[PDB]
Amino acid sequence: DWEIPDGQITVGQRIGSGSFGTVYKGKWHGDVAVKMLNVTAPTPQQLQAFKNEVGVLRKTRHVNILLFMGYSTKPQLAIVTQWCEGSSLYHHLHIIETKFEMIKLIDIARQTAQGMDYLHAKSIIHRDLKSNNIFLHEDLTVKIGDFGLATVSGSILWMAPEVIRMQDKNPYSFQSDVYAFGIVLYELMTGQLPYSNINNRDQIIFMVGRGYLSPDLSKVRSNCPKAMKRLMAECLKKKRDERPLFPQILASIELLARSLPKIHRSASEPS
Amino acid sequence: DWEIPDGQITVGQRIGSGSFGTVYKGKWHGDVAVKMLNVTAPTPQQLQAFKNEVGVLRKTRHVNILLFMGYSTKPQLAIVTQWCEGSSLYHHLHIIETKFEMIKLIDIARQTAQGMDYLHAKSIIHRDLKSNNIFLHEDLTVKIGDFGLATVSGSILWMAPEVIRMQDKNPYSFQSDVYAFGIVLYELMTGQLPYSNINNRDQIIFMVGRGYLSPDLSKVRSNCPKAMKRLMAECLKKKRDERPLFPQILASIELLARSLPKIHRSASEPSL
Amino acid sequence: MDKNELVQKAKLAEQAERYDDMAACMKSVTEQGAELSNEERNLLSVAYKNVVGARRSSWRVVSSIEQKTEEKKQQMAREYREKIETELRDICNDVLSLLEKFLIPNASQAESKVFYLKMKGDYYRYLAEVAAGDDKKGIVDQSQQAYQEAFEISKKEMQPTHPIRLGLALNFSVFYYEILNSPEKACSLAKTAFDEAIAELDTLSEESYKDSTLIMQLLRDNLTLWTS
Amino acid sequence: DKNELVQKAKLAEQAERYDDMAACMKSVTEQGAELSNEERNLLSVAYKNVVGARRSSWRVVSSIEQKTEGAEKKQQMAREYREKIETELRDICNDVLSLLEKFLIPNASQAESKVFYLKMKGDYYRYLAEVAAGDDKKGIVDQSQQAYQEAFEISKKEMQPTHPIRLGLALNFSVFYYEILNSPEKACSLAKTAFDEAIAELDTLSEESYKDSTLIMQLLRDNLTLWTS
Ligand SMILES: CN(C)CCOc1ccc(-c2nc(-c3ccc4c(c3)CC/C4=N/O)c(-c3ccncc3)[nH]2)cc1
Ligand SMILES: CN(C)CCOc1ccc(-c2nc(-c3ccc4c(c3)CC/C4=N/O)c(-c3ccncc3)[nH]2)cc1
């Protein structure tokens, strides 16, 4: 039972907006991050989504998954997690335009694939993978947060055509989760926002549904190994059943990590 | 429920022993740590302790607490937790005796004090504090393990005098961990094992158990601030009802952390 | 090997971490009578500071061993240590000699005058850090006005957000605590240098802010350690 | 004396003055007595550091010269400075090499001693091999491998395959083929196998040998990955 009593959590500087509200840098046994709706008289159906969010984050315990500390009822419906100091993957790639080494790119890709294997091993689907959701704790470890739309619309750049064409009431599938990882893989290696030469939204939503849209692999860095290119293509496939599950993607990346030239000059006697 | 189907939790290279089991470097959804006693058909009373250990770890959710991922019943009783890149602080002070930094020594001290403060909020008592439990995760973060003996005998250096006296069924208390933490703060600042003058066990229990022996702060290094030295004496008091609780400990450590000086005693360095 | 050609040779030595050859060439450049520009001033400062820095650190670690062993191990450390000052003294004497014949006498602009005087007083201070005995009193006496004369020149015709004046104040403060043992005076003048810096943030351009703020934090770092 | 020079060199190690350290240890070898393990290491580290600085100095200036084309005067001025580093690397390499050929190898008694100085002789020939050019370039490449082959043959017959000295010989020998002779297939062939037999006898590996070997073992694996790509 993680139902925290009222008055035990403070609120600091406003960090940003999450899934269904705003997140704050709280103070509860060290620096934490608390998400609240800051709206009085919560909507009756809004409580239904909030209780499931706590009821799904309570089943995740992994180094690569955001650590859920507790939730509050009064005076506000708030949920609090750990504080991953630093920034997010969105800030690193699209705000600051940071550059990482080839070993680092695989490290982020392997870890976010590592944690997602745990999520699908518990029959839990995240449904909102996106570079805003890849938090780099202490600049090394990667944590998967923002379980607002989890189960057991926001931006459309990171969803799937299988949830665009208005399918059965359960279009969110494991392969749909896999696709969002593939777009993230495009963001990592290419170092550019997908569809850079398109500057509208209404065209994007229809075009991906009919299968006429897919990220172009021309922006991929030349130093990227050919193994990722095959994996990227096999993960960006339009059809559902022809996309590999996370364990095979997870095992594919670990194979690539070993065969990577960490050092650029031949190593001599360490002495 | 946190039941894991058997077979997934592989077992790797042996590292050491735990409370009443042996730890391994396993593989279960990534690099993990698993501790098992490798004794098939276990005694029913050890299962109760094993069952109670999970009931306590399932109530801990913190950065400074070792992350409990799950527990395995078959083929052998075990729990699977996080794997800390590196070793315990004991290995950093008794195997390699790392020349630690004062600005880091306060930061590692503050993190530990923060860890037990969260534990005491949930009315959880560890009762097994020592330098072999301060897991330095890649030299930045600190986790607290060995929750087998804990609840909601020990090592002959890291107990308070009250529990050595063999008092009533619950001799450990909130302040008992504080003295154990104070013993920990002794090792960080001195860089040396406490009670190093006595090499025996029968003598040490009698002298410290009744209160005739207490650690001496002569070996603390010179550049240690006076404020930190006073705190060490304030937490190692003989009687439990006067030791400062963890909430006061955190504030005192953080108060001197802001005023803590840096290294390179003088600058005189333009970039040029 | 004219002025332009000799400057390039130092830059290659700078990139190759050949500080001895860097200082040897740069010493020749300033020994031709030409008026050094802004960039040659940095090359000369970098060349002679790095060579002293390695020797200063060698003495500092050696001195720690000598006084922490109490035969024959003490004399061998002393004999080795005595070799360190010898290398340190002539390299410091060389800079002091060259400053007073070619740089300072021809130093036209005051901002160039204060740099050399600031750089000049350091090498007395470096010798002061290791010279023991009656010579220590004399050597520190010559350094005091060099810091004082440089400080007052910047006090009038030079901005207090300028890195050199802020660097001089950082370099002027360290002298009292590390040699004269006067923390009360060192912190007092560090504060007014700090206070004069914080009051005119609305004047620096988009070029000199980086070096000024780097030195700015170094003043704070010493002040916190000094106030302990 | 003996102890005084050992202490003098050890004192110079903490002061980061390797030039004085190398000079002191040079006279220890000329004394004619056998060198124990702790003083053989001091010989290696003192001479490796002093030549390593020149190696980096030559490497950086050489890269500058090739990237500054178009102006012959800038290209011209880098050549004589490179030759200054070229010759300065030559005296220090010749100093140890002449010391090796006159006082170290002939006075060696143990088999492990002979291979250790043979590896150094090939190493200091390789350092000159990587920098020299012309007709004499292949000659010093030739003599370097003869020292290596003599060292490699002796190492296998006596020392265990988990011995760090043997690991260092194989690691240095593998780099010699790829970087100098440009034969990755032969370099990888020995590098690929040399990892395995040390793995094949990890049971007899001692705790003291666990620490130092794994740095060399991982470097061999690290080198293999670079050459594979
Ligand atoms: C839009 N404008 C504010 C620009 C800037 O945009 C944003 C900047 C930053 C963010 C941002 N959200 C989170 C975030 C996301 C999800 C959740 C939480 C925080 C607390 C619990 C939770 N449940 O979903 C964080 C963050 C988390 C952990 N450690 C550090 C930071 N950061 C969100 C938007
Ligand atoms: C030096 N002397 C004490 C000899 C002996 O040395 C040892 C050295 C190191 C260790 C050592 N025990 C753990 C340990 C302790 C408790 C628990 C686990 C591992 C997994 C489950 C658990 N519950 O408490 C670890 C470790 C933990 C996390 N990540 C990496 C390692 N390491 C045990 C003994």
Author numbering:
A (entry chain A): 449 to 600, 614 to 732
B (entry chain B): 449 to 600, 614 to 733
C (entry chain D): 1 to 70, 73 to 230
D (entry chain C): 2 to 230
Give passages from the manuscript:
RAF kinases are essential effectors of RAS, but how RAS binding initiates the conformational changes needed for autoinhibited RAF monomers to form active dimers has remained unclear. In quiescent cells, members of the RAF kinase family localize to the cytosol as inactive monomers, maintained in an autoinhibited state through intramolecular interactions between the RAF regulatory and catalytic domains and by the binding of a 14-3-3 dimer to two phosphorylation-dependent serine sites (pS365 and pS729 in BRAF). In response to signaling events and RAS activation, RAF interacts directly with GTP-bound RAS at the plasma membrane, which ultimately disrupts the autoinhibited state and promotes RAF dimerization and kinase activation. Here, we present cryo-electron microscopy structures of full-length BRAF complexes derived from mammalian cells: autoinhibited, monomeric BRAF:14-3-32:MEK and BRAF:14-3-32 complexes, and an inhibitor-bound, dimeric BRAF2:14-3-32 complex, at 3.7, 4.1, and 3.9 Å resolution, respectively.
It should be noted that despite the presence of MEK in the cryo-EM sample fraction, no density corresponding to MEK was observed in the 3D reconstructions. Additionally, the RBD and CRD as well as other regions of the N-terminal regulatory domain (residues 1-448) were also missing from the density map and are expected to be solvent-exposed and flexible. As expected, a 14-3-3 dimer was bound to each C-terminal pS729 site, forming a stabilizing bridge between the KD protomers. In our inhibitor-bound BRAF2:14-3-32 structure, interpretable density for both C-tails stops at residue 733, indicating that the C-tails (residues 734–766) are flexible after exiting the 14-3-3-binding pocket. In addition, density corresponding to the RAF inhibitor SB590885 was observed in both active sites and overlapped with the position of the C-tail segment in the ligand-free dimer structure. This finding shows that insertion of the C-tail into the active site can be overcome by inhibitor binding and is consistent with recent biochemical analyses of active BRAF2:14-3-32 complexes using differential scanning fluorimetry, microscale thermophoresis, and surface plasmon resonance approaches, which indicated that both ATP-binding sites are available for ligand binding even when the C-tail segment is present.
